[PDB]
Amino acid sequence: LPPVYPVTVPFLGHIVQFGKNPLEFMQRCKRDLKSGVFTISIGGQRVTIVGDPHEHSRFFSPRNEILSPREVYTFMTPVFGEGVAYAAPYPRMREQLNFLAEELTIAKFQNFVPAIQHEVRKFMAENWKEDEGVINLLEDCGAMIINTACQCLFGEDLRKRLNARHFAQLLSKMESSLIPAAVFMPWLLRLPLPQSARCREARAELQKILGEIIVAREKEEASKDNNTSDLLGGLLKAVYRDGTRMSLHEVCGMIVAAMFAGQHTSTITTSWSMLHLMHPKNKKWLDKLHKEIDEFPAQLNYDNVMDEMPFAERCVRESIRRDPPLLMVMRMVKAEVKVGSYVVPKGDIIACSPLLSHHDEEAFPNPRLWDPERDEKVDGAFIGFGAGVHKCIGQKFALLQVKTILATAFREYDFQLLRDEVPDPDYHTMVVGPTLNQCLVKYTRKKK
Ligand code: HEM
Numbered sequence: 001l002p003p004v005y006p007v008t009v010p011f012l013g014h015i016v017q018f019g020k021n022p023l024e025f026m027q028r029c030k031r032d033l034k035s036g037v038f039t040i041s042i043g044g045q046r047v048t049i050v051g052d053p054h055e056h057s058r059f060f061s062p063r064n065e066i067l068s069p070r071e072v073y074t075f076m077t078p079v080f081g082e083g084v085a086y087a088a089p090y091p092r093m094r095e096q097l098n099f100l101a102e103e104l105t106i107a108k109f110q111n112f113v114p115a116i117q118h119e120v121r122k123f124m125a126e127n128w129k130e131d132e133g134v135i136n137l138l139e140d141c142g143a144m145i146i147n148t149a150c151q152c153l154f155g156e157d158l159r160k161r162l163n164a165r166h167f168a169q170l171l172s173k174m175e176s177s178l179i180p181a182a183v184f185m186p187w188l189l190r191l192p193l194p195q196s197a198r199c200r201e202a203r204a205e206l207q208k209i210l211g212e213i214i215v216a217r218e219k220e221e222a223s224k225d226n227n228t229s230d231l232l233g234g235l236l237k238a239v240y241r242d243g244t245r246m247s248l249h250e251v252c253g254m255i256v257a258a259m260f261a262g263q264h265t266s267t268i269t270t271s272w273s274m275l276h277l278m279h280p281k282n283k284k285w286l287d288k289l290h291k292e293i294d295e296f297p298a299q300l301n302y303d304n305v306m307d308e309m310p311f312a313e314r315c316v317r318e319s320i321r322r323d324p325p326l327l328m329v330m331r332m333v334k335a336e337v338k339v340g341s342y343v344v345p346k347g348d349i350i351a352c353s354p355l356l357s358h359h360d361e362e363a364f365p366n367p368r369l370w371d372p373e374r375d376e377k378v379d380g381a382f383i384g385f386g387a388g389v390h391k392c393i394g395q396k397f398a399l400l401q402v403k404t405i406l407a408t409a410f411r412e413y414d415f416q417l418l419r420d421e422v423p424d425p426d427y428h429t430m431v432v433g434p435t436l437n438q439c440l441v442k443y444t445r446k447k448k
């Protein structure tokens with residue numbers, strides 16, 4: 001019932017083309033097969049891709065039992081470790097998930113904007129020192145966000161310890177971790193992974209060491225001199241539902257994950273956004289962005305970013321729309337499911353691509369055009385943050401981070417993209433972002 005693309009090489013499959021260009025390969029699969037839904041073989045494994053925006057509801061709705069993400073996202077354990085992310089089943093993953101959620105509440109967001117905005121201005125005075133100057137944005141942002149993410153989630157104690165090493169190293173230690181065309185084949189990363197074997201463990205060291213000093217540093221007990229409800233402190237104090245406590249190797253793995261989600265996708269998104277806004281073709285938009293923020297005070301607050309920054313969010317979302325950081329959302333088909341006229345059978349890897357769907361013509365016309373005031377012409381087409389049972393729970397914070405950054409930066413600077421056109425998407429990484437070497441930019445301080 002479901003279609004399949006022709007397989008020239010049986011064992012390798014289409015992983016050759018998909019790697020060279022996944023956007024044009026998938027669009028070519030969809031176009032030639034003459035169907036939104038289709039199947040491809042990656043390493044003797046049927047991968048059914050949903051390219052029809054109207055059928056998104058089929059993909060994202062079903063429960064974990066019908067479509068499981070665990071056994072497809074096993075490739076991620078080398079990055080966090082054991083007992084983190086999709087290593088545990090529902091209960092323990094839900095347990096850690098709600099530890100994160102506990103730190104991401106409507107109440108705790110009151111600190112975030114002041115905390116973020118301070119950290120930005122700090123980094124800005126630290127790295128962008130002269131009135132003018134040249135610096136590549138992707139790496140400078142990667143640092144920016146590592147502070148703002150850490151400051152909000154883990155608090156003031158860590159942002160301090162990590163410093164110049166995490167400012168650039170944890171950034172790099174994470175930038176390093178990325179690996180392409182291995183997810184579909186989890187067998188490859190097992191024996192010979194390129195660096196994540198050393199980098200994740202080397203990364204694991206630096207924070208295991210500062211995880212051991214933290215007991216000797218603060219009083220933080222019965223003096224009530226600081227009401228610390230941060231993530232880490234509570235994360236190593238925490239006990240699971242089954243009685244067992246967090247391991248030192250585990251809490252380390254969590255701190256890594258929280259920072260990954262808080263930084264990697266957000267920094268990509270922060271960059272794309274700025275790149276688009278500083279282009280000359282989008283001056284009409286940049287002008288509009290200033291009309292929005294120019295009446296704010298120096299000290300922004302929660303209400304300013306949430307309630308009073310509509311267009312900035314539009315720019316951020318459309319940037320995530322055009323070049324979605326996560327290409328392929330995937331599930332293990334542990335039970336049959338109807339998807340339009342076809343059926344997808346048990347045992348398959350069913351997947352849905354934000355990249356593909358965001359470039360569907362009906363939903364998004366002239367999809368390569370960054371138009372922040374556009375809207376999804378098909379409902380539920382945009383899946384940048386996913387949807388359904390596994391919808392991103394960090395969407396608020398991500399948008400808060402980015403919008404705040406944009407507000408703080410563009411208020412006190414002007415940027416000149418040292419290129420004719422905007423950077424290409426570097427699809428070498430599965431976690432996609434603008435091409436590193438194309439991101440060189442002249443900053444220019446603003447003065448009244
Ligand atoms: C631009 C920023 C971000 C993007 C593009 C993004 C993207 C995504 C996507 C596509 C998914 C769904 C994957 C799927 O359906 O299988 C998702 C889920 C999730 N994201 Fe994000 N995310 C972002 C920021 C964040 C942040 C800041 C956090 C935490 C601070 C976070 C934590 C999560 C969690 C916990 C899930 C749950 C998925 C599950 O239940 O299996 N994300 N994210």
Ligand SMILES: C=C(CC[C@@H](C)[C@H]1CC[C@@]2(C)C3=C(CC[C@]12C)[C@@]1(C)CC[C@H](O)[C@@H](C)[C@@H]1CC3)C(C)C
Nearest residue numbers: 073076085096097100257258261326328329430431
């Ligand atoms: C840090 C969290 C969990 C956050 C986890 C679930 C997030 C962070 C990175 C995310 C978004 C990633 C996910 C989905 C969920 C992850 C693992 C995936 C696996 C989505 C599928 C993509 O193909 C792949 C590139 C990304 C990798 C990053 C708690 C353990 C505290």
